[PDB]
Amino acid sequence: SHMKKFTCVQDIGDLKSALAESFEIKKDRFKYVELGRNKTLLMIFFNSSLRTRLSTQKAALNLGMNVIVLDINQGAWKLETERGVIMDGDKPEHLLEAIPVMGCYCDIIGVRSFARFENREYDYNEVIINQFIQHSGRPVFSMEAATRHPLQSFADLITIEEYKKTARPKVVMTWAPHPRPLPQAVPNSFAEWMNATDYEFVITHPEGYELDPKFVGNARVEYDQMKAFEGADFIYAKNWAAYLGDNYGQILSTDRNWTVGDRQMAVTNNAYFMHCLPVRRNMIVTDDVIESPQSIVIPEAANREISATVVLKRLLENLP
Amino acid sequence: RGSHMKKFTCVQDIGDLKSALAESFEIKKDRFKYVELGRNKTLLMIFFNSSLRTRLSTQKAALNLGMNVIVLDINQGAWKLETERGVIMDGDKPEHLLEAIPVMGCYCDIIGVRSFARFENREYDYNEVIINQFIQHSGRPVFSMEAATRHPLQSFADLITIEEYKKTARPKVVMTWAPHPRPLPQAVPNSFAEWMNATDYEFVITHPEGYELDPKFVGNARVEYDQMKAFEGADFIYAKNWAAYLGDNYGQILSTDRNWTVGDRQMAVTNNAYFMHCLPVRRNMIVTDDVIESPQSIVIPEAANREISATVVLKRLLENLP
Amino acid sequence: RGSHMKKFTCVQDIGDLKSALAESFEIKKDRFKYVELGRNKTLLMIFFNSSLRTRLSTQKAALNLGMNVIVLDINQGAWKLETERGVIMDGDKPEHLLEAIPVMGCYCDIIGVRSFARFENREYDYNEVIINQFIQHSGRPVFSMEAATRHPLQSFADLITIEEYKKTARPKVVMTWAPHPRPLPQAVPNSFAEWMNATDYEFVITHPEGYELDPKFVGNARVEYDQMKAFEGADFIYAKNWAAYLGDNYGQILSTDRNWTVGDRQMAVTNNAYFMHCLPVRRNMIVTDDVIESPQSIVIPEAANREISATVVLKRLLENLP
Ligand SMILES: CCC[C@H](NC(=O)CCC(=O)O)C(=O)O
Ligand SMILES: CCC[C@H](NC(=O)CCC(=O)O)C(=O)O
Ligand SMILES: CCC[C@H](NC(=O)CCC(=O)O)C(=O)O
Secondary structure (H helix, E strand, O other): OOOOEEOOHHHHOOHHHHHHHHHHHHHOOOOOOOOOOOOEEEEEEOOOOOHHHHHHHHHHHHOOOEEEEEEOOOOOOOEEOOOOOOOOOOOOEEHHHHHHHHHHOOOEEEEEOOOOOOOHHHHHOOHHHHHHHHHOOOOEEEOOOOOOOHHHHHHHHHHHHHHOOOOOOEEEEEOOOOOOOOOOHHHHHHHHHHHOOOOEEEEEOOOOOOOOHHHHOOOEEEOOHHHHHOOOOEEEEOOOOOOOHHHOOOOOOOOHHHOEOHHHHHOOOOOEEEOOOOOOEOOOEOHHHHHOOOEOHHHHHHOHHHHHHHHHHHHHHOOO | OOOOOOEEOOHHHHOOHHHHHHHHHHHHHOOOOOOOOOOOOEEEEEEOOOOOHHHHHHHHHHHHOOOEEEEEEOOOOOOOEEOOOOOOOOOOOOEEHHHHHHHHHHOOOEEEEEOOOOOOOHHHHHOOHHHHHHHHHOOOOEEEOOOOOOOHHHHHHHHHHHHHHOOOOOOEEEEEOOOOOOOOOOHHHHHHHHHHHOOOOEEEEEOOOOOOOOHHHHOOOEEEOOHHHHHOOOOEEEEOOOOOOOHHHOOOOOOOOOOOOEOHHHHHOOOOOEEEOOOOOOEOOOEOHHHHHOOOEOHHHHHHHHHHHHHHHHHHHHHOOO | OOOOOOEEOOHHHHOOHHHHHHHHHHHHHOOOOOOOOOOOOEEEEEEOOOOOHHHHHHHHHHHHOOOEEEEEEOOOOOOOEEOOOOOOOOOOOOEEHHHHHHHHHHOOOEEEEEOOOOOOOHHHHHOOHHHHHHHHHOOOOEEEOOOOOOOHHHHHHHHHHHHHHOOOOOOEEEEEOOOOOOOOOOHHHHHHHHHHOOOOOEEEEEOOOOOOOOHHHHOOOEEOOOHHHHHOOOOEEEEOOOOOOOHHHOOOOOOOOHHHOEOHHHHHOOOOOEEEOOOOOOEOOOEOHHHHHOOOEOHHHHHHHHHHHHHHHHHHHHHOOO
16 A cells, blocks of 8 residues: 555565565556656666666566666666775775665665675665665665565565465475575565464474574474475475574575475475476576475566566556 | 578578568567567577677677577587587596586577687588588577678678668679788678579678688679779678688788778779778778778677567567477 | 757757746646657667656656657667778677668657767767767757757756746856766767856856866856865856766776765855756765755655656657658
């Protein structure tokens, strides 16, 4: 109703009407194509992106909006994040001017800023995405911040609601091996959203990979993957670098027994396989599992356009 | 057949050249006549390689039809893609082509893909594996922005331009090889041969020994190893370099013999022939500064038609969307 | 002029400043008043160098008028261009500016170009070769997004903002140099001077010894080598760095004297002068964290005006298209 931003599941409000708007748009994609007329959306990327990048633009177009995609670093000037420093080097511009400026030429702003893993507090305080909310002078929405990825999660919800065979399915989020250290933003956001639902949500990961409590909530945590997978209805695999104190942003394991393969899927209740994507085949999941019919990885991606369209619509409706 | 365009990768896709030409000139005359046809329709242009002409003329084409445009440079703004299936993705690539293709198809209505020959495996390039995967798994109509072995958008523009300047019904069009510093794909030459072979033009291909093109593209086109003989009485000169193709020289430079550089020497022997080149062009390599700057050079009006060929193709595709 | 705009590279192109500012504030008031003027008209924005403000603001401006927009980053998505004629293109560059320019002109209606001075040859930069070749060969109206020696879109933005906040009819506007770690083009300064010199303002330029600008730009503007003196009783402080321009020091850094860094010390001596800067600004080099964050700083409302200057220029250009 009165959406001023979109960085967490709280901003979307009641999940019932949110899911209603979602399926309404899936049914009539351009129904609100006149809503965003003469409204401009500025998409800012500090990181790579295929899905968010494409689906958000399609989403804005579904609402008749103008779209400006800006890849800082590539086309603009490197930004100085720390205040008070003497800008006599690498950075030609300071985030403190850049943010307000960018806000001068748009109506809504989308920002993607991966966790830098330099300082756990700096990341978890979502300093950057917050400065955009504080000084852009425009409604801001996350395209993945340091600790959350609402647009993705919202999409994960829509798709599960879409394929679930029972009213309260067992949804198991599972960790998987990866060669590089990834943020825990996707995992945090998933947990955050599944917890807002009535699903039988379970989190499984190797020892040492506990996520932030404020995110895990009262979700059951199982250190045995095969157990957690038992009778699952949906498997949401995703890797994430450590989080606890002395290991923040670190790779503690690359154990390939966690790679979601047929073995683990067999113990499930013919569960569907999900994943936000990008996905490293034969690392996170076997070719067979991802290529199998229980894999709804694509319908999942498709819904990204919907979550984004719905969010964008709400944001527009609340514009002055 | 032209009213049933499901894709656009070769000359067969365009159907009757007569009507295809008719539309081309209709649109040259009235650029935004169909600006309402693709309203709320979205085009996704995907580049795996650099581009100026295709990049710019396709977007303009899309806009002439009122479409929405999204240009994506994989590698630059996205994640590197793994092209081989079955491999363990424990390295350089975060995403696999198998997921990327379908994903991309989710957010648009029509897809345009540019993927140059990689020259790593001839079969891989000539079976057009990549471009075909986009066709098989994208879920959308796909048009080539230059694949490994063809470049229909260009050749279509070439046909339009030749039909636009030709002084006779069946001119002598000579495609000539030229020296180049790097190994280039035989896509433009192939596609040119294919389109010209589809016309009633007197088509001749001239290149040094060792640079013969795939027979399926050469067709029954006369092949002349004496550049000066080929140029005689020509009405159009289509210069373009391409790396070797046969046997052990696939994707190799056999020579950089500057005797083939198109200079006033060869042009003189022609019937005051027009000079054409798809661009980019390395001056004083492929063609002399004098020739390319000469009034017979229609290099630009040629490039300009790239907008027309793309508009007609996109229009056909729109008309055949579900 | 102004009513017959065929380009926009310098202040003469805008014409009568009075009506120019009239349109500027008309648009600030009603941003999409002419959203139908540029329908089906396409704008091509070319970038040879980085940009945040021109890049963003120009697109917004175009969208205000309902135009189609294509942003192109040569080097990134296109092929590297050969700027010199007559060379044998057998290396780094696959395309020559001589084809590229005309080609780019084929797919749009209006062209915006950004080409920073290269500091390789003073005459080459001040003759504004590149920006002029676009004007000669694009076959389209060309507006500057910052050439080697001017940046009209910025200075027109500055004029709009100074007129927007000035407290008297003819304020004292001082443009002051400032230290920087790298050599920058004198485009912004030149351009600022040029626009100020066309106003009834009291214009003063202050910089270290050795940093005198091109006389053609300086005009009859007062040049004070004592920063503190110049700042005395100022109404506006327009800080900006620039590398040497005179003889043997073209494109060089003669000084990094931090006493010139605009701080509270200098602002103190002004008449509660506003602080301005085109941006990007290196904090604690050009200006103090405090001065820029101070309430006298109108750096952002200034930047916001970039959208207006570009919307007015684009509008005039549209109104003068065939
Ligand atoms: C609009 C100003 C553009 C430019 N500034 C830079 O190139 C600054 C880059 C740096 O600070 O290193 C200049 O001085 O002309
Ligand atoms: C939407 C997912 C984005 C990201 N994943 C990656 O960046 C994976 C990159 C890699 O595989 O190297 C993450 O975990 O947040
Ligand atoms: C439209 C032509 C595209 C490409 N050309 C190049 O890759 C030229 C590169 C160079 O000149 O270095 C080719 O030959 O297929």
